[PDB]
Amino acid sequence: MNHEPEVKATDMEEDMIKRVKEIAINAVKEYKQEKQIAHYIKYEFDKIDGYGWNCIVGRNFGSHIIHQTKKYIFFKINELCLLLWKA
Amino acid sequence: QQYKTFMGARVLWPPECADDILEGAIRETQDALKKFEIAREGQKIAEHLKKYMDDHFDPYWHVFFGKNFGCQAVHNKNRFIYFYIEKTAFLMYQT
Amino acid sequence: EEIEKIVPTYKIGAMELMTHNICTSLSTWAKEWKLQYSQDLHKRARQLLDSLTEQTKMLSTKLSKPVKDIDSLGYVMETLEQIRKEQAEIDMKFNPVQEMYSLLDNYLPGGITDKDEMDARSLLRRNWDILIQQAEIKGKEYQHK
Amino acid sequence: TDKEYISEEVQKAIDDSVKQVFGIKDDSSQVTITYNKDKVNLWTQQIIDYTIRGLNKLGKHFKYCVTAILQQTNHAGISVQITAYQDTNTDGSLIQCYEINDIYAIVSVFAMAV
Amino acid sequence: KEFNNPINFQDTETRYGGIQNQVVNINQYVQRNPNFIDLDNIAELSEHSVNTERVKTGDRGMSHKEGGWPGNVDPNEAQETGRFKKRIEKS
Amino acid sequence: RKREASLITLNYIKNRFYPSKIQKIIKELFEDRLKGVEYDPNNANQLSERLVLELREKIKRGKVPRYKIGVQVVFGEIKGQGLRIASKCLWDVQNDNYASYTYTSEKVYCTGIVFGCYFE
Amino acid sequence: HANEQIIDMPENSEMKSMKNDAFSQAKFAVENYKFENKISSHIKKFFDEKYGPNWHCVVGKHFNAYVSYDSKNFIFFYEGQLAILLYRKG
Amino acid sequence: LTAQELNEDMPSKMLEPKNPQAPKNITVYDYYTRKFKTDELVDQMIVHFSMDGDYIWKESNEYKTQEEIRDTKKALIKEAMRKQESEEPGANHDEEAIKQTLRNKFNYNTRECQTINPSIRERGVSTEPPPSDTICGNITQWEIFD
Amino acid sequence: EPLPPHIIRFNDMAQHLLKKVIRQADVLIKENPQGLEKDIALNLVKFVKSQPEFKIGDGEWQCIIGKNFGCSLTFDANVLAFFDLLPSRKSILLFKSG
C-alpha cells in the first residue's frame, strides 16, 4: 500500500496542493521509471498552469532553484522526494 | 543454471556482466587466491577484491564468496558476476 | 554486561573467593560513570533545544512587528529569506536533536525536567509548523503590503 | 539453387518494411509524417522488427544484421560506409538510402552463411 | 563429417552509403525558445538470484545382522544356503 | 567434465571476449584518425571511407580470426540535429556478439558499429 | 547459538520497528521456506515493502563477505544454525 | 525465427532475433505497488548513438506552442514597459532593465531543498561454522553389559 | 589549462562555458568534501551568475546536485549543462528555465 504524501517545503494555494498530490499518486502507479514519473507530472501541469514548468524525482539530491511565487511545491512520498516549480 | 569453464574458472555461462569486467575480475581473484588462502584469513581477500573493483570499475561493488550460501540481489545492467573455482563460489554485483 | 555476566564466586585447589562483595561495589561506580557521560550529553542536548526554541522565537518576533514603515519591510524581508534557508538546513539539523534527546531518555534514570521540557519540545515542533503556516499567510499579506 | 543470397530479394524486403511503416507509395505524397523526437524512438524499433520479419519470411539459413540510421531533415553532411570480412562466393551485404519527405533514413543489411 | 574450417575466409568488399543534397532554407526554424529534456542519473537495475549447488542427500537403511555369504546366494532364503553348504561338501 | 567436452562438439564457439576488447581497439584507432575535430568538408567523405578499411583489418589483428567480421562506420555533421542510430542482428544467442563505440566532438560525431558472427 | 552478532541499526527515533522486524521475519522465513535463496527473496521483499527499496540480503551456512552499506541500516544475526545478513545501499 | 540443423547429427541449435548483450530482465521498484517489479520481456534492440536535438519545422504543432510562450512573455514585458512608461513622466527605461525590473523578491522567491542521505560505510563479516571433531567408538556385547 | 575528471551525460552548451563550470564545480566540492549538496549548489549558482559574459538571458541560473535523481525540465536553447565528476561520483545539473 502507498499512503498519501507529506509536503515538506511548499508555496501552493489550498485548491492547488490537492491537485498536486492528486497528479502525484496517478503518476507513481502509471510509470515505474524515475524519469518517466517526472515527465508525466510536467506535461499534465502544462495544461493547468501555463507552458512553463519543471519537475525532478530524486531518492537522494539537493538544490536551490528560482521559482514563481505561489508556484512551488516539494512533497516527499514514502522514501522518494519530488521537487516541482515554475520558470 | 547451466555453468561453463572459461579462464580456469566455473562461471554461469550467460555472462550477466560485460565480458571485459568479468575477465579482469576472475583473473584478479585467481591472482589474489594464489597469495592469500580462503581457509585461513578469508575476510582479508574479500576486502582486497572489493577495493580493486572500485579502482578499475564503477564504485559500490558488493562481494560475497562462500562454500555454501544462497542470495537474491538487485544489481545494475551488466554488473553481476557469479563464478565457482575448485569448490568455492564467488558472487559480486555493482550498485 | 561484564558486571551482569561476572561470575559470583571462583575457586582454586584449596581456596574460594567471594566476588559479589567487590563486584556489587563496581556496578554502582561504573553506573556513576555512564551517569556522568549522560550528564555531559544532557547539558549539550539541552543547549541545542534552547538554541532551536530561541531561533524559532527570534523569527516569530519579526512577524509579530507591525512593519508599517518602509525601512521596517527591508529588515524583516531578509528574515523570510532566512526562514526559508532555516527551513532547508533545520530539517537536517533537527534529525540529530530528535535522536540525541531519545538516546538520552533510554540511558538516564532521570525523567528530563519533569514534564516542563517534554511540553517545551512538543510546543517547539508545533511552533515550527505554525511558523511555516504564518510565513505563507505573511507572504500574501506582504504582496498586499 | 534453393538456398543462396540475392541482391534483388533483400532490397524488396527493405522496400516492404519502409512501406509497412509509412509508404502507401503510388507516386504521390499521400501521407506526410515530419520527424518528432518522440516518434523517432518508436519508428526505429518498428522498422527494424518489420525488416527482420520481412527477411525471415523468404529467409534461408543466413544470419541477418540490420542497422537503422534516421536523419532529421538532412542539411548535414552524413556519409555511411560498410565493409564485410566475408568470402565473396559465400555472402554479400547491401545498404539502401530512402528520401521520405521530412525524415531521411538509411538501412543496412549484412548477410552471413550458416 | 562434423564442422571444420579449412576453407580460406579472407575476401572483403565495401559499399558507400550517402544521402542526396537539398535546399539551404529547408523551411524550418532552428531551436525552440524553451527545450524539454528528461535526464535520468540512475542506472536500470535487474535482479538475479544465485544459490550454491547443495550436494544431493540420499537416505538408505541396510542391516548387517546376517553373516557374510556370497552375492548369488541369499542369507534369509533357506534353500539358497542349504544348496551352497551341499556344494562345499563334494575335498 | 564430459558435458563440457560434449559442449565443444555441438558448437566449438571459440568465444573470444568480443565486446569491450574490440570497443577498446576501435576507440584507440578512431581518436588518432579523426585528427582535426573541426574538419567535416565534402572532400573528407572520401577520407572517412579510408578510415573504415583500416578499421576492419585491426579487428582481424585483435584476436578474432574464426569469427566473420562486418563493420559499418557513420561520419556526420551535428547542428543540434536529432537522429538515433539503432541496430538489431539475427544470430546465435551467447555464440555471437556486437561491439559499438561513439565519439562526439564539438562540431562532429563518428559512430563505429562492428558485427562478428562465428562460422565453421 | 548466536554468540556474536553485529547490530548497526538506528534504534533511536522509533526505528526499532526496522531492527525487531529483522529478528522476527528471519525466524518465520527460515522454518517455513527451508531454502537459502528463497529466504533472501522473502526477508528482502518484506524490508522493501515497509522501509522503501534498495535492500540487499544474503543467507548462507558458511560464507565470507565485505560490502558497502548505508550507515544505521546493516544488521548481522544468526537465526538458529543459519547466518542471515541484510543491509541498505542506495 | 528459424532453426539450423548441424551436419552429422550434432545437437540442433537456432538463431533468435534477440540481442544477447542486452540484459535478461529489467526491474524498477514501484512505490504504488510498494514492492520490486520484474519485467522478463525487454526491448532487446541495441542503439549505437542516440541524439535528441532542438530542430523544428515551420507550422509544426510544437512551434505554435513555442510562439504562444514568446507572445505571453512579450505581453507581460509590453504591459510592464507601458505601465512603467505611463506611471513615470517620459520614462527612459530600456526593455532589458524592465525584465530585470519585472523579476522581484515578492514575484520570484528562491528556495533551497535537499533530501537526508545516509553516509555510505564499508564493513566485513566472515561466518565460519562450528568446529567438527572426529570421534571413534567401538561397542562389544561385554562393554554394553559391563 | 587542466580540466578535472568528469562524465558528460548531456551537454547542450558551448564548450568555453562548460569547461569554466566544471573547473569551479571540482574546486567547490574539494573545498567542503562530505558537505551537503545544497551548500555546493548555492555557491555554484552564485559563481556562474557573478561571472560576466556567462549570461545567455531568458530564465535565471538554477543548479541541482545529487547522487540519485531523474527529472524533466524546460530550459533555454544551448544553456543546460549536465556532468558527473569521477572522483566525487556526484551528478551536477545547471540550466536556465523561462
Side-chain angles (χ1 to χ4, degrees), chain A, chain B residues 1-16 18-95, chain C residues 1-21 23-145, chain D residues 5-23 37-114, chain E residues 1-2 5-91, chain F residues 1-67 69-119, chain G, chain H residues 1-47 49-146, chain I:
Chain A
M1 191 176 172
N2 187 19
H3 60 264
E4 284 190 340
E6 46 178 5
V7 287
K8 301 307 183 79
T10 13
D11 187 39
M12 272 288 182
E13 303 163 346
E14 279 74 9
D15 296 44
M16 280 298 311
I17 191 171
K18 293 183 181 178
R19 295 287 192 283
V20 191
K21 288 163 63 271
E22 172 187 41
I23 293 283
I25 295 163
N26 291 342
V28 161
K29 74 185 179 175
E30 188 170 330
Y31 305 92
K32 285 58 165 175
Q33 294 284 7
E34 295 257 316
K35 67 168 190 174
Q36 290 177 8
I37 289 160
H39 178 81
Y40 179 75
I41 304 300
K42 200 182 58 53
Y43 262 90
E44 295 290 83
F45 268 107
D46 282 32
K47 277 188 294 295
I48 182 161
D49 301 329
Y51 43 104
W53 208 265
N54 289 307
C55 301
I56 300 192
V57 181
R59 223 200 168 286
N60 106 82
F61 78 112
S63 181
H64 105 259
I65 306 168
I66 299 165
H67 67 74
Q68 183 181 321
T69 312
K70 309 183 198 179
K71 309 285 180 178
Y72 175 98
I73 165 155
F74 172 91
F75 58 91
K76 175 170 186 182
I77 217 165
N78 39 43
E79 310 300 331
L80 169 149
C81 313
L82 203 152
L83 168 52
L84 73 83
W85 71 89
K86 186 181 194 289
Chain B
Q1 205 167 331
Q2 181 173 36
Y3 297 92
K4 181 67 167 292
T5 72
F6 98 65
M7 208 145 211
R10 183 145 178 273
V11 72
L12 185 71
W13 180 212
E16 284 300 327
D19 300 18
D20 166 53
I21 295 174
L22 214 173
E23 191 205 337
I26 280 176
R27 194 67 216 160
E28 191 64 30
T29 58
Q30 285 195 132
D31 281 7
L33 286 157
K34 205 79 169 63
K35 184 67 174 171
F36 330 118
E37 291 88 316
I38 300 167
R40 69 197 292 179
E41 300 179 326
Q43 167 50 42
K44 188 201 298 177
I45 193 174
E47 184 166 16
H48 158 86
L49 183 60
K50 187 268 190 293
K51 284 180 166 58
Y52 164 90
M53 292 288 157
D54 302 348
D55 295 333
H56 292 100
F57 314 124
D58 292 321
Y60 306 108
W61 275 91
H62 310 226
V63 174
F64 279 82
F65 71 80
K67 310 187 77 176
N68 175 78
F69 75 96
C71 148
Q72 177 191 284
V74 169
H75 62 81
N76 325 330
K77 297 201 297 183
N78 310 11
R79 294 290 185 281
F80 183 94
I81 309 161
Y82 181 62
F83 69 101
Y84 274 83
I85 32 168
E86 304 301 326
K87 172 59 190 170
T88 57
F90 280 57
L91 175 59
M92 47 200 183
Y93 51 96
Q94 204 243 322
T95 304
Chain C
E1 284 171 55
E2 293 182 311
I3 299 175
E4 182 182 35
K5 294 176 190 183
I6 191 189
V7 165
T9 188
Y10 311 50
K11 302 181 178 175
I12 59 162
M15 305 188 74
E16 311 176 28
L17 312 177
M18 297 296 296
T19 78
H20 170 88
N21 306 358
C23 166
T24 305
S25 318
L26 295 158
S27 334
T28 304
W29 187 58
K31 269 179 182 185
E32 275 285 309
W33 265 73
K34 93 162 174 56
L35 279 176
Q36 251 282 334
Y37 272 115
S38 287
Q39 279 263 15
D40 303 336
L41 188 144
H42 182 119
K43 289 182 186 179
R44 192 172 205 75
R46 215 185 152 76
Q47 281 167 43
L48 302 187
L49 271 185
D50 295 332
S51 80
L52 284 182
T53 46
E54 285 179 11
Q55 185 196 277
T56 57
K57 217 303 186 179
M58 177 56 176
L59 271 305
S60 296
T61 58
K62 294 132 175 194
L63 304 185
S64 81
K65 288 182 186 185
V67 186
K68 293 186 175 182
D69 296 10
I70 282 176
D71 288 21
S72 191
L73 268 96
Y75 161 84
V76 45
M77 257 276 77
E78 291 190 8
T79 73
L80 288 190
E81 298 309 322
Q82 186 186 323
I83 281 174
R84 292 166 175 109
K85 289 182 185 185
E86 284 178 11
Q87 196 164 27
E89 293 183 328
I90 203 180
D91 212 323
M92 303 283 303
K93 179 179 173 183
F94 256 116
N95 203 61
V97 173
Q98 297 163 325
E99 294 187 333
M100 265 278 284
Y101 172 100
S102 185
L103 184 157
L104 180 154
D105 192 14
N106 207 55
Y107 273 72
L108 258 179
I112 53 282
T113 319
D114 299 31
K115 303 178 183 180
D116 314 324
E117 176 64 283
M118 287 185 72
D119 291 14
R121 182 164 172 279
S122 60
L123 281 170
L124 173 155
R125 190 61 172 183
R126 188 180 179 180
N127 279 13
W128 184 259
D129 192 22
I130 288 168
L131 188 160
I132 299 172
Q133 289 182 20
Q134 190 178 356
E136 292 169 41
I137 298 300
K138 275 283 175 185
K140 298 169 192 183
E141 287 173 8
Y142 254 94
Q143 288 174 36
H144 294 297
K145 284 165 181 182
Chain D
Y5 153 91
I6 305 184
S7 61
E8 294 148 43
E9 290 189 349
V10 168
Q11 281 199 60
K12 285 176 181 188
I14 301 163
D15 270 48
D16 291 11
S17 66
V18 169
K19 279 188 181 193
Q20 267 289 329
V21 67
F22 42 63
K37 69 182 155 61
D38 300 346
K39 298 185 166 185
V40 151
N41 188 36
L42 179 56
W43 273 326
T44 49
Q45 191 168 35
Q46 198 163 330
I47 283 170
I48 276 172
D49 281 330
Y50 273 123
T51 53
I52 291 165
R53 190 202 68 178
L55 287 163
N56 192 6
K57 184 166 61 59
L58 185 52
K60 321 306 174 191
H61 320 284
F62 290 99
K63 285 176 181 175
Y64 278 107
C65 307
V66 180
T67 88
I69 302 170
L70 308 187
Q71 185 175 27
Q72 208 63 33
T73 71
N74 62 61
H75 198 51
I78 201 172
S79 288
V80 181
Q81 300 295 305
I82 185 173
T83 84
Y85 204 99
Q86 188 78 28
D87 279 316
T88 51
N89 309 42
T90 66
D91 305 271
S93 53
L94 276 172
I95 296 198
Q96 214 70 7
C97 309
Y98 296 91
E99 305 177 45
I100 308 151
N101 209 333
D102 281 27
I103 192 167
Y104 275 69
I106 305 177
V107 178
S108 64
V109 179
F110 296 82
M112 320 294 284
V114 186
Chain E
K1 222 202 192 184
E2 292 222 314
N5 165 32
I7 199 166
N8 34 37
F9 176 81
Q10 194 175 1
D11 286 351
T12 55
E13 305 188 326
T14 81
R15 197 155 281 101
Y16 47 97
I19 69 96
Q20 298 194 200
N21 278 28
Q22 220 196 28
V23 181
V24 176
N25 188 9
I26 226 302
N27 304 321
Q28 303 194 354
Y29 307 127
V30 66
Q31 291 182 323
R32 293 200 301 289
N33 153 306
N35 183 17
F36 305 53
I37 294 290
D38 326 338
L39 298 178
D40 197 352
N41 185 59
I42 308 169
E44 291 177 14
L45 302 172
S46 59
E47 78 183 338
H48 276 290
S49 57
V50 295
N51 177 19
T52 52
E53 272 66 49
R54 193 169 184 179
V55 182
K56 295 169 183 58
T57 37
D59 323 316
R60 189 172 302 101
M62 299 299 299
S63 191
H64 182 58
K65 171 175 56 51
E66 291 158 11
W69 275 81
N72 285 348
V73 194
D74 304 332
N76 283 129
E77 302 299 334
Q79 289 191 16
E80 267 55 33
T81 63
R83 301 168 315 175
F84 190 83
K85 290 184 190 184
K86 283 188 182 188
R87 286 185 197 100
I88 290 176
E89 58 190 319
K90 284 187 170 188
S91 292
Chain F
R1 301 173 183 177
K2 289 190 173 183
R3 259 283 161 278
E4 181 57 29
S6 190
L7 204 159
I8 299 166
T9 71
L10 30 143
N11 40 19
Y12 278 84
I13 311 177
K14 276 52 174 57
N15 178 34
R16 313 324 286 267
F17 306 115
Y18 200 83
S20 226
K21 190 186 281 165
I22 300 299
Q23 195 253 39
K24 193 182 71 176
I25 286 289
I26 67 186
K27 170 171 182 298
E28 191 172 321
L29 181 53
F30 268 118
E31 289 162 28
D32 293 24
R33 303 298 183 182
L34 263 38
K35 292 185 173 186
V37 293
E38 291 180 31
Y39 288 85
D40 190 343
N42 292 349
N43 292 27
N45 153 52
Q46 195 193 327
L47 298 183
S48 72
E49 186 278 329
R50 186 188 46 74
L51 164 59
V52 193
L53 163 56
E54 184 64 22
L55 182 52
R56 70 151 192 272
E57 179 59 296
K58 193 180 289 299
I59 311 308
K60 195 268 158 196
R61 178 176 291 284
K63 307 186 177 293
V64 178
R66 190 61 167 283
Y67 264 123
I69 309 101
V71 58
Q72 168 173 15
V73 172
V74 54
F75 164 92
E77 190 185 338
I78 71 100
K79 311 194 310 309
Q81 185 194 32
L83 69 92
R84 223 180 69 84
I85 301 171
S87 17
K88 200 176 171 167
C89 180
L90 193 300
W91 43 27
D92 283 49
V93 168
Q94 296 164 45
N95 310 350
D96 306 320
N97 211 320
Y98 81 92
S100 67
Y101 178 76
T102 181
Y103 180 93
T104 59
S105 84
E106 189 176 357
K107 197 63 179 175
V108 174
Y109 94 99
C110 225
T111 304
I113 302 98
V114 192
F115 296 103
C117 295
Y118 163 82
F119 189 65
Chain G
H1 283 274
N3 300 323
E4 184 60 28
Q5 301 119 310
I6 293 173
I7 292 171
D8 187 11
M9 289 291 296
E11 198 181 320
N12 317 345
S13 188
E14 278 291 347
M15 229 67 159
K16 281 162 284 175
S17 184
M18 319 205 170
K19 188 207 79 71
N20 291 344
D21 283 32
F23 281 107
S24 184
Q25 279 298 332
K27 188 268 152 199
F28 168 92
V30 162
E31 183 55 35
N32 296 354
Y33 284 66
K34 197 191 170 61
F35 211 55
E36 276 66 29
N37 164 37
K38 273 185 169 186
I39 308 312
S40 298
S41 80
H42 178 89
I43 293 167
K44 180 180 173 309
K45 271 175 191 66
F46 183 87
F47 266 68
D48 292 328
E49 274 177 31
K50 209 168 160 185
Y51 323 130
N54 303 343
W55 291 76
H56 321 131
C57 72
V58 178
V59 177
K61 304 177 200 294
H62 163 81
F63 68 101
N64 273 282
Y66 194 79
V67 66
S68 58
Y69 62 102
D70 288 4
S71 49
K72 307 185 164 181
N73 299 284
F74 174 111
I75 194 172
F76 170 66
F77 55 80
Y78 286 82
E79 203 292 318
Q81 283 72 15
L82 193 53
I84 296 173
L85 175 57
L86 68 93
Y87 54 89
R88 191 205 289 285
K89 165 54 214 177
Chain H
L1 199 279
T2 95
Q4 68 193 102
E5 65 185 352
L6 299 314
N7 204 331
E8 292 297 325
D9 312 48
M10 286 187 214
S12 61
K13 66 187 174 169
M14 62 182 298
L15 53 169
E16 301 178 342
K18 55 175 67 178
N19 153 262
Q21 190 161 329
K24 184 55 177 166
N25 53 297
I26 296 171
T27 70
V28 181
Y29 181 86
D30 248 325
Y31 294 77
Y32 183 81
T33 317
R34 195 54 175 159
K35 60 177 290 190
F36 268 109
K37 173 176 180 300
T38 176
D39 303 53
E40 169 53 35
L41 186 152
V42 304
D43 296 340
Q44 214 128 44
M45 179 203 186
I46 78 94
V47 60
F49 186 57
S50 58
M51 207 175 184
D52 309 337
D54 219 15
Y55 223 101
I56 301 299
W57 59 293
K58 172 192 324 188
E59 298 180 344
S60 88
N61 186 34
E62 296 165 307
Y63 181 77
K64 290 182 189 181
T65 62
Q66 178 212 323
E67 267 208 324
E68 183 70 2
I69 297 170
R70 285 189 161 180
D71 289 16
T72 49
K73 285 180 188 176
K74 178 173 271 72
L76 293 177
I77 291 161
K78 187 176 178 180
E79 283 180 28
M81 174 161 188
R82 269 216 147 197
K83 280 188 178 185
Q84 188 163 206
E85 190 174 354
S86 187
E87 284 163 17
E88 210 164 5
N92 196 44
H93 288 260
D94 302 326
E95 294 221 50
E96 185 174 16
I98 291 160
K99 290 169 55 55
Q100 190 270 305
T101 298
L102 187 157
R103 289 195 303 282
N104 309 353
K105 203 77 172 181
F106 58 99
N107 193 91
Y108 268 103
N109 229 286
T110 77
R111 306 172 167 216
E112 21 231 52
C113 179
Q114 84 189 141
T115 69
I116 312 177
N117 329 147
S119 308
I120 72 90
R121 194 77 73 77
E122 51 176 43
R123 188 179 208 104
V125 176
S126 59
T127 85
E128 293 177 14
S132 302
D133 292 311
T134 179
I135 192 167
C136 331
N138 56 325
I139 199 65
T140 57
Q141 185 54 23
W142 59 271
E143 187 169 10
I144 292 170
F145 177 84
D146 192 289
Chain I
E1 288 186 338
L3 187 67
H6 69 292
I7 308 298
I8 301 293
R9 314 278 189 167
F10 198 66
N11 169 44
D12 198 37
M13 199 185 275
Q15 289 295 146
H16 290 271
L17 303 178
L18 179 78
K19 288 162 62 170
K20 197 148 57 178
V21 169
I22 294 161
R23 283 197 204 79
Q24 173 58 36
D26 178 47
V27 168
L28 191 55
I29 292 176
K30 188 184 167 187
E31 275 170 28
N32 41 34
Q34 304 190 335
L36 285 312
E37 327 305 28
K38 78 94 164 288
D39 175 45
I40 298 165
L42 194 155
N43 293 317
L44 180 48
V45 171
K46 186 183 269 69
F47 176 91
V48 297
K49 187 174 174 178
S50 293
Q51 282 198 136
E53 98 201 330
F54 197 85
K55 302 172 195 180
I56 310 159
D58 291 47
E60 201 61 36
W61 286 106
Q62 44 195 240
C63 187
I64 306 85
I65 303 182
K67 301 187 76 182
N68 168 318
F69 76 96
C71 48
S72 64
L73 308 321
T74 52
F75 57 94
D76 183 30
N78 302 342
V79 188
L80 158 60
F82 203 111
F83 58 97
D84 182 12
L85 305 186
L86 194 63
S88 304
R89 283 125 171 187
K90 290 168 60 171
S91 38
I92 297 179
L93 172 69
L94 173 68
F95 63 92
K96 303 182 83 168
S97 55

